[PDB]
Amino acid sequence: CSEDRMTLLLRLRAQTKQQLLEYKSMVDASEEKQIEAKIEDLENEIEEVKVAFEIKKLALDRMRLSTALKKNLEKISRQSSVLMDNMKHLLELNKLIMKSQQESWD
């Protein structure tokens, strides 16, 4: 029951951040061959900073998930979950994928 509200709040926050960024950018901005170079330089800088921000966020989230998963290892081994079935299916699929990759290489 709480998962529905959690997902709804996460989606609402993710949309509200993106909308507030655009609002703030518009308010801040409210206050021929030599122009395209500046435009492309600005967009390249924007891409370069966005990539770094995304990388940092992903790394932080992955580290948090890793430590939270390591803290409770034995519970996922004693009475684990259907997650064990998911893990065995992934383990069965990965080997076949790698074998097909080697065959394609040859």
Partner: protein, 172 residues
């Protein structure tokens, strides 16, 4: 009245599109093709003949505007040229698209393609081609328009309309 992009606050997981054209049957078919599928957002479609619109406050904010130009009639071209003078410049920053219809049957065309190409290049907006009389192409065009609307509405983290303006830029 002049239409402004950011006059009202956005809704809760809601995207709105506006279709301006002279042929009402094609607009109705396009709206049906856009709404026939299921997506994660709540879509709304408004239909109009020309600008400006009748005054109303109940109308929510608009996220995308598509101008449909029929190459088989100069009346639609004149209507679009007249309507293009009632929108502010801030709406042309990745929130306006042009859709040309009728380029398949060249024998029926009364307007040269250079005209619509120059018109799209002047206002710095993309130009799409589709024959709305065929359902197979209309479905794909509707899906593409729905994706563009979802991008422009702010439902994709990291991508905005100003970025879409640079993604769809032409070299020459």
């Amino acid at each position: 009245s002049v239409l402004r992009p950011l006059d009202k606050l956005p809704g809760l997981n809601t995207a709105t599109i506006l279709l301006v054209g002279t042929e009402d049957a094609l607009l109705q078919q396009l709206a049906d093709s856009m709404l026939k599928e299921d997506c994660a957002s709540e879509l709304k479609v408004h239909l109009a003949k020309s600008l400006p619109l009748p005054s109303s406050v109940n109308r929510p904010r608009i996220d995308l505007i598509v101008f449909v130009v029929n190459l088989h009639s100069k009346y639609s071209l004149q209507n679009t040229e007249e309507s293009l003078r009632h929108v502010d410049a801030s709406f042309f920053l990745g929130k306006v698209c042009f859709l040309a219809t009728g380029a398949g049957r060249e024998s029926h065309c009364s307007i040269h393609r250079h005209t619509v190409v120059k018109l799209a290049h002047t206002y710095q907006s993309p130009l799409l081609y589709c024959d709305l009389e065929v359902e197979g192409f209309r479905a794909t065009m509707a899906q593409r328009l729905v994706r563009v609307l979802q991008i422009c509405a702010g439902h994709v983290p990291g991508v905005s309309a100003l970025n879409l303006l640079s993604l769809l830029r032409s070299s020459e």
